[PDB]
Short mmCIF file of C-alpha atoms in Angstrom, two decimals:
data_model
loop_
_atom_site.label_atom_id
_atom_site.label_comp_id
_atom_site.label_asym_id
_atom_site.label_seq_id
_atom_site.Cartn_x
_atom_site.Cartn_y
_atom_site.Cartn_z
CA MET A 121 -13.32 -7.12 -16.80
CA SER A 122 -14.52 -8.16 -13.57
CA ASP A 123 -14.27 -11.71 -12.07
CA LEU A 124 -15.17 -13.83 -8.57
CA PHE A 125 -13.55 -17.17 -7.37
CA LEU A 126 -15.18 -19.42 -5.34
CA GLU A 127 -13.02 -21.40 -2.43
CA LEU A 128 -14.19 -24.36 -2.11
CA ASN A 129 -12.55 -28.07 -1.04
CA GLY A 130 -10.22 -27.02 -1.90
CA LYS A 131 -10.37 -25.87 -5.09
CA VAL A 132 -10.30 -22.92 -6.77
CA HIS A 133 -13.34 -21.96 -9.02
CA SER A 134 -14.00 -18.88 -11.06
CA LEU A 135 -17.52 -17.70 -12.07
CA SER A 136 -16.59 -16.93 -15.18
CA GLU A 137 -14.57 -19.79 -16.06
CA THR A 138 -16.99 -22.65 -14.60
CA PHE A 139 -19.89 -21.07 -16.40
CA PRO A 140 -19.33 -19.71 -19.68
CA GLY A 141 -22.41 -17.98 -20.71
CA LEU A 142 -22.59 -16.11 -16.72
CA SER A 143 -20.27 -13.25 -16.41
CA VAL A 144 -19.91 -10.94 -12.90
CA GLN A 145 -20.44 -6.97 -14.10
CA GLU A 146 -19.73 -5.69 -11.23
CA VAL A 147 -19.20 -6.14 -7.52
CA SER A 148 -19.37 -4.06 -3.86
CA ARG A 149 -19.24 -4.64 -0.53
CA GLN A 150 -21.25 -3.88 2.15
CA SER A 151 -19.55 -1.32 4.82
CA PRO A 152 -18.69 -3.19 8.10
CA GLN A 153 -21.88 -2.83 10.52
CA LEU A 154 -20.79 -1.01 13.91
CA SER A 155 -23.00 -1.63 16.97
CA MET A 156 -22.27 0.44 19.37
CA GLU A 157 -23.74 -1.46 23.08
CA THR A 158 -25.81 0.60 24.27
CA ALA A 159 -27.21 1.30 28.31
CA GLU A 160 -29.33 3.88 28.83
CA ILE A 161 -29.96 5.40 32.28
CA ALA A 162 -33.21 6.97 33.07
CA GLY A 163 -33.45 11.37 33.04
CA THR A 164 -29.98 11.22 31.48
CA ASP A 165 -28.99 11.90 27.60
CA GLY A 166 -27.46 10.16 25.26
CA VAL A 167 -26.15 6.40 26.30
CA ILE A 168 -22.64 4.57 27.74
CA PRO A 169 -21.44 2.56 25.49
CA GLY A 170 -19.83 -0.34 25.64
CA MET A 171 -17.82 -2.77 23.69
CA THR A 172 -17.83 -1.84 20.42
CA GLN A 173 -18.62 -4.45 17.94
CA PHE A 174 -18.96 -5.15 14.17
CA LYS A 175 -22.47 -7.70 13.23
CA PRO A 176 -22.19 -9.89 9.56
CA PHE A 177 -22.23 -8.10 6.25
CA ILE A 178 -22.66 -8.44 2.41
CA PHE A 179 -20.66 -8.82 -0.48
CA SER A 180 -23.02 -8.11 -3.71
CA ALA A 181 -21.75 -9.38 -7.16
CA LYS A 182 -24.36 -8.22 -9.80
CA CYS A 183 -23.96 -10.58 -13.29
CA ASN A 184 -25.29 -11.45 -16.35
CA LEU A 185 -26.18 -14.83 -17.95
CA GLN A 186 -26.76 -15.30 -21.56
CA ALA A 187 -27.61 -18.72 -22.64
CA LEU A 188 -27.72 -20.64 -26.59
CA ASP A 189 -30.89 -21.25 -25.75
CA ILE A 190 -34.38 -21.63 -23.90
CA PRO A 191 -33.55 -25.37 -23.09
CA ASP A 192 -29.71 -24.10 -22.30
CA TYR A 193 -30.87 -21.80 -20.05
CA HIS A 194 -33.09 -23.53 -18.06
CA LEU A 195 -30.61 -25.93 -18.10
CA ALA A 196 -27.13 -22.91 -16.36
CA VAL A 197 -29.63 -22.00 -14.43
CA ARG A 198 -29.63 -25.32 -12.41
CA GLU A 199 -25.96 -25.97 -12.34
CA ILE A 200 -25.35 -21.74 -10.87
CA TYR A 201 -28.24 -22.84 -8.34
CA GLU A 202 -26.11 -26.43 -8.10
CA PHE A 203 -22.86 -24.78 -7.57
CA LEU A 204 -23.17 -21.47 -5.37
CA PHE A 205 -25.98 -22.93 -2.68
CA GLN A 206 -23.71 -25.88 -0.55
CA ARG A 207 -24.38 -27.33 2.65
CA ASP A 208 -21.61 -25.31 4.85
CA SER A 209 -19.30 -22.17 4.08
CA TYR A 210 -17.05 -21.25 1.57
CA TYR A 211 -14.57 -18.78 0.72
CA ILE A 212 -15.05 -16.29 -2.30
CA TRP A 213 -12.67 -13.40 -3.54
CA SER A 214 -12.11 -11.06 -6.60
CA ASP A 215 -10.02 -9.38 -9.02
CA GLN A 216 -10.70 -6.46 -7.73
CA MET A 217 -8.35 -7.22 -4.45
CA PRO A 218 -7.23 -9.80 -4.69
CA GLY A 219 -5.33 -10.49 -2.19
CA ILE A 220 -8.44 -10.53 0.45
CA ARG A 221 -11.01 -13.30 0.92
CA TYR A 222 -14.43 -13.60 2.86
CA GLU A 223 -15.63 -16.88 4.30
CA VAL A 224 -19.64 -16.86 3.34
CA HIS A 225 -22.74 -18.33 2.96
CA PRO A 226 -25.27 -17.51 -0.34
CA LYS A 227 -28.01 -16.13 -0.34
CA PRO A 228 -31.70 -16.36 -1.62
CA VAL A 229 -31.58 -14.63 -5.48
CA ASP A 230 -34.11 -15.03 -7.79
CA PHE A 231 -33.14 -14.85 -11.70
CA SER A 232 -34.89 -11.83 -13.36
CA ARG A 233 -35.68 -12.93 -16.85
CA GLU A 234 -35.66 -10.29 -19.40
CA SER A 235 -35.75 -12.49 -22.57
CA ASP A 236 -35.64 -15.39 -23.57
CA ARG A 237 -32.12 -16.53 -23.47
CA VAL A 238 -30.79 -13.49 -20.89
CA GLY A 239 -31.33 -13.50 -16.66
CA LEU A 240 -30.58 -10.31 -14.37
CA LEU A 241 -28.68 -12.86 -11.29
CA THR A 242 -27.47 -10.55 -7.58
CA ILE A 243 -25.43 -12.61 -6.22
CA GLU A 244 -25.19 -12.27 -1.89
CA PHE A 245 -23.06 -13.89 -0.10
CA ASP A 246 -23.52 -13.38 3.82
CA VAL A 247 -20.34 -12.64 5.51
CA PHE A 248 -21.03 -13.82 9.32
CA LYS A 249 -17.42 -13.61 10.58
CA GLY A 250 -17.76 -9.64 10.34
CA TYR A 251 -14.64 -8.86 9.31
CA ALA A 252 -12.63 -9.68 6.27
CA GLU A 253 -9.50 -11.56 6.38
CA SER A 254 -6.13 -12.04 3.94
CA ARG A 255 -5.75 -15.03 2.00
CA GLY A 256 -2.81 -16.20 3.28
CA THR A 257 -1.28 -16.25 6.54
CA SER A 258 1.86 -15.03 8.24
CA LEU A 259 3.64 -17.72 7.46
CA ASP A 260 3.73 -17.45 3.63
CA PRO A 261 6.28 -15.00 2.62
CA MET A 262 6.45 -11.73 0.80
CA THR A 263 7.92 -12.92 -1.64
CA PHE A 264 6.95 -11.54 -5.64
CA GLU A 265 6.70 -14.98 -6.50
CA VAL A 266 4.02 -16.56 -3.85
CA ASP A 267 1.41 -14.23 -5.66
CA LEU A 268 -0.84 -13.55 -3.08
CA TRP A 269 -0.05 -9.56 -1.37
CA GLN A 270 -1.66 -6.53 -2.74
CA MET A 271 -1.66 -3.55 -2.16
CA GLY A 272 -4.04 -2.11 0.58
CA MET A 273 -3.45 -4.30 3.25
CA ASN A 274 -1.82 -2.05 5.69
CA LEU A 275 2.01 -3.69 4.98
CA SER A 276 5.04 -1.41 7.36
CA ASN A 277 7.09 0.06 3.71
CA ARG A 278 9.17 1.47 6.37
CA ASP A 279 11.13 -2.51 7.41
CA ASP A 280 10.74 -5.68 6.77
CA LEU A 281 8.17 -8.64 8.33
CA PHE A 282 9.37 -11.91 9.29
CA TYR A 283 7.48 -14.43 11.55
CA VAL A 284 10.16 -16.65 12.78
CA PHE A 285 12.67 -15.77 15.33
CA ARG A 286 15.58 -17.26 17.10
CA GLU A 287 15.93 -14.41 20.04
CA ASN A 288 14.52 -13.81 23.57
CA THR A 289 13.40 -10.91 22.46
CA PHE A 290 11.44 -9.35 19.05
CA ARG A 291 9.20 -7.38 17.54
CA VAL A 292 6.13 -9.05 15.77
CA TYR A 293 3.86 -7.15 13.58
CA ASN A 294 0.57 -7.54 13.32
CA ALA A 295 -1.21 -5.45 9.83
CA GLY A 296 -4.50 -6.30 10.41
CA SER A 297 -7.33 -3.84 11.39
CA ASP A 298 -8.27 -6.21 15.01
CA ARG A 299 -6.10 -7.62 17.78
CA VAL A 300 -6.01 -10.75 17.26
CA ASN A 301 -7.28 -13.02 19.83
CA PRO A 302 -7.98 -16.99 20.13
CA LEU A 303 -10.69 -16.21 22.33
CA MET A 304 -12.89 -13.85 19.67
CA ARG A 305 -12.44 -17.15 17.52
CA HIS A 306 -9.52 -16.15 15.94
CA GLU A 307 -7.11 -17.87 14.11
CA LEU A 308 -4.00 -17.64 15.60
CA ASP A 309 -0.53 -20.70 16.04
CA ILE A 310 2.47 -20.96 18.15
CA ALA A 311 4.76 -23.56 17.39
CA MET A 312 8.12 -23.10 19.73
CA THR A 313 10.77 -25.53 20.47
CA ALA A 314 13.55 -24.39 23.30
CA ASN A 315 15.49 -25.71 26.59
CA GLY A 316 14.04 -25.26 30.05
CA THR A 317 11.20 -23.79 30.97
CA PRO A 318 9.76 -21.19 29.08
CA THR A 319 8.02 -18.29 29.47
CA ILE A 320 6.67 -15.89 26.82
CA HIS A 321 5.53 -12.84 27.38
CA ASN A 322 3.54 -9.69 25.27
CA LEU A 323 4.17 -6.21 26.55
CA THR A 324 2.81 -4.36 25.00
CA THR A 325 -0.90 -5.96 25.94
CA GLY A 326 1.12 -7.10 28.46
CA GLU A 327 0.55 -10.67 28.58
CA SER A 328 2.64 -13.82 29.84
CA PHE A 329 1.93 -17.53 28.89
CA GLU A 330 3.64 -19.76 31.69
CA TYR A 331 5.31 -23.67 31.53
CA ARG A 332 5.59 -25.05 34.27
CA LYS A 333 7.56 -27.77 33.23
CA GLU A 334 11.15 -28.83 30.88
CA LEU A 335 11.20 -27.70 27.57
CA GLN A 336 13.94 -30.16 24.85
CA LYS A 337 15.60 -28.25 22.09
CA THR A 338 13.35 -31.76 20.41
CA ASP A 339 9.93 -31.06 21.23
CA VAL A 340 8.17 -28.48 19.80
CA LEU A 341 5.52 -26.90 21.64
CA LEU A 342 2.26 -25.42 19.61
CA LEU A 343 -0.39 -23.23 21.17
CA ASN A 344 -3.46 -23.03 19.09
CA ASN A 345 -6.10 -21.09 19.53
CA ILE A 346 -6.71 -21.56 23.12
CA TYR A 347 -4.87 -25.58 23.79
CA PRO A 348 -1.34 -25.67 24.49
CA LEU A 349 -0.21 -28.84 23.62
CA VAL A 350 3.81 -30.17 23.07
CA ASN A 351 4.10 -32.95 20.49
CA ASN A 352 0.74 -33.32 20.18
CA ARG A 353 -0.62 -33.57 23.80
CA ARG A 354 -2.43 -31.60 25.67
CA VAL A 355 -0.88 -30.07 28.59
CA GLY A 356 -3.34 -27.40 29.56
CA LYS A 357 -2.77 -28.74 33.50
CA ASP A 358 1.06 -27.72 32.96
CA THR A 359 0.25 -24.00 32.62
CA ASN A 360 -1.02 -20.64 34.17
CA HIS A 361 -3.79 -20.65 31.23
CA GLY A 362 -2.65 -17.50 29.87
CA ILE A 363 -2.79 -16.75 25.89
CA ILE A 364 -0.77 -13.91 24.83
CA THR A 365 -2.76 -11.88 21.99
CA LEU A 366 -1.37 -9.79 18.67
CA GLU A 367 -2.55 -5.59 19.01
CA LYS A 368 -2.59 -4.15 16.21
CA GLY A 369 0.57 -2.25 14.51
CA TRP A 370 4.26 -4.44 16.94
CA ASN A 371 4.19 -6.32 19.45
CA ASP A 372 6.87 -6.50 21.77
CA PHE A 373 7.91 -9.97 22.64
CA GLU A 374 9.92 -11.43 25.05
CA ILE A 375 10.36 -14.98 26.24
CA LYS A 376 12.42 -15.92 29.55
CA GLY A 377 13.60 -19.41 31.00
CA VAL A 378 15.05 -21.31 27.81
CA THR A 379 17.78 -20.46 25.68
CA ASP A 380 18.37 -21.50 21.76
CA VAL A 381 14.55 -19.73 21.09
CA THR A 382 12.82 -20.85 17.70
CA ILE A 383 9.31 -19.35 17.66
CA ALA A 384 6.97 -18.83 14.93
CA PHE A 385 4.17 -17.05 14.40
CA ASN A 386 1.50 -18.08 12.32
CA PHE A 387 -1.52 -15.87 12.40
CA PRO A 388 -4.05 -14.05 9.48
CA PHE A 389 -4.72 -10.75 8.80
CA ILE A 390 -7.97 -8.90 10.05
CA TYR A 391 -9.48 -6.66 7.73
CA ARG A 392 -12.67 -5.05 7.82
CA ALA B 21 -30.35 2.69 -76.48
CA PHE B 22 -27.88 2.19 -78.69
CA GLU B 23 -24.07 3.47 -79.74
CA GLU B 24 -22.89 0.80 -77.29
CA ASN B 25 -24.77 2.66 -74.88
CA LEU B 26 -21.62 5.02 -74.68
CA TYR B 27 -24.22 7.82 -72.84
CA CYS B 28 -27.72 5.39 -72.32
CA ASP B 29 -26.51 2.93 -69.60
CA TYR B 30 -29.73 0.27 -70.18
CA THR B 31 -27.98 -2.45 -68.43
CA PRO B 32 -30.45 -3.62 -65.14
CA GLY B 33 -28.23 -4.23 -62.59
CA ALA B 34 -30.18 -3.07 -59.94
CA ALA B 35 -33.68 -1.78 -59.29
CA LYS B 36 -31.56 1.11 -56.64
CA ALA B 37 -35.79 2.13 -55.69
CA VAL B 38 -38.93 0.50 -56.02
CA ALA B 39 -42.10 2.62 -56.02
CA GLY B 40 -43.82 3.12 -53.06
CA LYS B 41 -47.51 1.94 -55.21
CA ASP B 42 -45.66 -1.29 -55.56
CA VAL B 43 -45.41 -2.03 -52.60
CA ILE B 44 -49.26 -3.39 -51.00
CA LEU B 45 -50.64 -4.86 -48.37
CA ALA B 46 -52.91 -8.01 -48.01
CA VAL B 47 -55.13 -10.22 -45.48
CA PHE B 48 -56.34 -13.71 -45.45
CA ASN B 49 -60.32 -14.12 -45.63
CA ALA B 50 -61.95 -15.77 -42.87
CA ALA B 51 -62.01 -18.99 -45.02
CA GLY B 52 -58.25 -18.14 -45.39
CA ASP B 53 -58.93 -19.01 -49.15
CA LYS B 54 -58.20 -16.90 -50.70
CA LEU B 55 -56.46 -13.61 -50.63
CA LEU B 56 -58.07 -9.73 -50.76
CA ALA B 57 -55.66 -6.73 -51.26
CA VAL B 58 -57.51 -3.59 -49.37
CA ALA B 59 -59.36 -2.06 -51.80
CA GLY B 60 -57.72 1.19 -52.12
CA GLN B 61 -54.53 2.21 -50.17
CA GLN B 62 -52.58 4.74 -49.55
CA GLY B 63 -50.16 4.52 -47.32
CA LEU B 64 -48.08 1.77 -45.99
CA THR B 65 -46.16 1.35 -42.29
CA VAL B 66 -43.51 -1.88 -41.13
CA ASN B 67 -42.19 -0.83 -37.82
CA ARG B 68 -40.86 -3.78 -35.80
CA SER B 69 -38.28 -2.76 -32.79
CA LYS B 70 -36.19 -4.66 -30.29
CA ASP B 71 -35.56 -4.22 -26.46
CA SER B 72 -31.97 -3.96 -25.36
CA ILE B 73 -31.87 -5.04 -21.69
CA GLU B 74 -27.73 -2.42 -19.79
CA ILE B 75 -25.38 -5.16 -18.42
CA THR B 76 -23.48 -2.30 -18.06
#
């Protein structure tokens, strides 16, 4: 059995459950739209590729609606149109792969009336970020009872994966298919509490974030995307304005200038 | 038709068949007041069909 789940206004709605007469036949996903920024020099052969990018793509769901009678059919069509089309983008996922969700916007799709009570539909959701992300962030535990993780999410079956560290040198595993960069509108949060003047170094990437003031254990330093704060107060003037990024796989992190470090990473995995 | 129906089962329970000559087609005239059976009928066929929609 196939079904489609929609996250809207903080509520999860099953498409089949919401509309009893509507059942999802099949789901499908367009392949990533790779595009190399070609540059052509006249007289030479081929192109000089720039930086490969990914265009928005389409997630499709073929379904059918079976109503009791004609007024019921029209009412169901209107209610489905009301439910699907909202002002802002929402989230969708499928039973087949319940660990991966897409932030999407609906597309105009017309009901194909086959009989007096049945109508075929092929809903298409445009995903504009160009990638899919996990339903849960890195802060969620990798436990069975959380009911969030599934197979095929590049989870390493060779070592434990935790995202809270108590020492000055450790490794963090980004399981996504893209390098997590807040400059690319990626979600990434770091919460560190320690004593002294801190400096975070990502050795594999080679990046370094530097804060130039003394810190106490009671003050939390929070880097969200491209904003560093202490106690939710912007302190960008007192930093080196550097930002760390998470490469694919393992990243070696070293923290200098502080003691009793407690650093936590909170970011979703980027799939495609 | 007797002897306790030992060998002749005369009890009517079902027709078990209908002679084709018994079923005929008639039409209503232009005024619609009288039904008229078409003269000299010899073969009648009624076809009823329903479409199928694939929801695989």
